Design a protein around this ligand. Sequence first.
Ligand SMILES: O=C(O)CCC(=O)C(=O)O
Ligand SMILES: [Mn+2]
Length: 203
Amino acid sequence: SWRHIRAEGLDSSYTVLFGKAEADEIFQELEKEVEYFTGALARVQVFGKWHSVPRKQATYGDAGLTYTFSGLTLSPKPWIPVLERIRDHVSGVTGQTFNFVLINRYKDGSDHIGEHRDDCRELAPGSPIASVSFGASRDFVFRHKDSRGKSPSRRVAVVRLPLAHGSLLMMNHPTNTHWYHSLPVRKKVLAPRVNLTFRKILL
DNA sequence: CTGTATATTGCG
DNA sequence: TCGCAATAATACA
Ligand SMILES: O=C(O)CCC(=O)C(=O)O
Ligand SMILES: [Mn+2]
């Protein structure tokens, strides 16, 4: 069964792919195998200022591709067994295909990601995004674009969702046209979390 | 009276 | 501790 997350312009689906034992093993292999970007490849530019990202990132996928957000371009690394196994399984469950994965690792509840839409030029038009989570459960927040700021034109409610160990969140079109998402700071969370967002990228 | 868009600071 | 409006400076269209 899928929990359907629906609101005006919001269309997402949530389910648990893996039980505890399997999700533990996958997490441990991710921790062991994934090579994260450092230094110059972990700095972004937002509002005219450069910052080191408050988390760790890695990109895997087919050769040739490119992934640019916030002034930072990330070349994908060749697929490794554990990412292919997760990719293929998501594909078998959803029917959707993927040639790329972005990995965000939050070492604890102080690591986080800011509010944004996934609306890249390099993202295939109307292609779903598969977000698979491992480790600590973290709250994932959807805010509507017209409901943000000083004076909002719309009073659409915020949508909050705990992403569990071994879960899958599907973000279908047009979720990313109208809704920003983020993983806010959760100061009580002491354990790491690894998130995989599988995507379809144009060459 | 009025373009649009975007990590931490500075509040509450 | 949590939420979030303001905004570091441009870069557009
Ligand atoms: O950490 C997550 O659950 C999602 C991360 C994300 O949205 C991104 O990396 O663009
Ligand atoms: Mn995202």
